[PDB]
């Protein structure tokens, strides 16, 4: 599923991401835009053999099991394929664990390089929330 901007903002708000660990909703929409272009089915392989999955490009090196990342962890206790669903529940719940692990949203490289320090409120401007 390719979400619209305001559609995704509303879904993330319903799932409790607005101001989660102090990160306003616009931060999460901005991260999703540049990680996946709002596409739940996005995948990308990393140099070390791990793979990033879904709307927030969560990495099989630490967070999910895809059966092909030897020596990795599965800290969200899910198969990585669950992060590609049109229902974003699994991605949101795993992202909550990630952002709580000490480094905040700096875990998302695209957030750090393209959202951090910008006017992220623009990403939810005009949306009915």
Annotated binding residues for substrate:
101
- Which residues, other chains included, contact 63 with Cβ-Cβ below 8 Å and sequence gap of 6+? 73, 74, 75, 76, 94, 97, 98
- When asked if residue 101 is in the footprint of Cl ion (CB under 5 A), the reply is no
Residues tagged in the binding site annotation: 101
Rule CB under 5 A: choose which of 2, 18, 41, 104 binds Cl ion.
104
Q: How far apart are CA 68 and CA 44, in angstroms?
A: 14
Q: Per-residue x/- mask for Cl ion, residues 74 to 93, rule CB under 5 A?
A: -------------x------
Q: How far apart are CA 7 and CA 11, in angstroms?
A: 6
Out of Na ion, Cl ion, none, what residue 93 binds, judged by CB under 5 to 8 A for its kind, is none
- When asked if residue 60 is in the footprint of Na ion (CB under 5 A), the reply is yes
Rule CB under 5 A: choose which of 48, 109, 121, 129 binds Cl ion.
121
CB of 77 to Na ion, least distance (A): 11
Which backbone phi and psi does 57 adopt, to 5 degrees? 55, 55
Report the sign of the C-alpha dihedral through residues 110, 42, 18, 124, in that order: positive
Q: How far apart are CA 84 and CA 36, in angstroms?
A: 11
Bridge partners, residue 23, by sequence: 20
CB of 21 to Cl ion, least distance (A): 6
7 is catalytic: no
CB of 74 to Na ion, least distance (A): 5
Instruction: Give the binding site for Cl ion (CB under 5 A).
Output: 5, 24-26, 69, 87, 104, 121
């Amino acid at each position: 599923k390719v979400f619209g901007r305001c559609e995704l903002a509303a879904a993330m708000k319903r799932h409790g991401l607005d101001n989660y660990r102090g990160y306003s909703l616009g931060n999460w929409v901005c991260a999703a835009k540049f990680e996946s272009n709002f596409n739940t089915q996005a995948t990308n392989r990393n140099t070390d053999g791990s793979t990033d999955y879904g709307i927030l490009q969560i990495n099989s090196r630490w967070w999910c099991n895809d059966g092909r990342t030897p020596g990795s962890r599965n800290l969200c206790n899910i198969p990585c394929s669950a992060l590609l669903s049109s229902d974003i529940t699994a991605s949101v719940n795993c992202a909550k664990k990630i952002v709580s692990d000490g480094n905040g949203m700096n875990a998302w490289v695209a957030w750090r390089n393209r959202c951090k320090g910008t006017d992220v409120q623009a990403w939810i401007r005009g949306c009915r929330l």
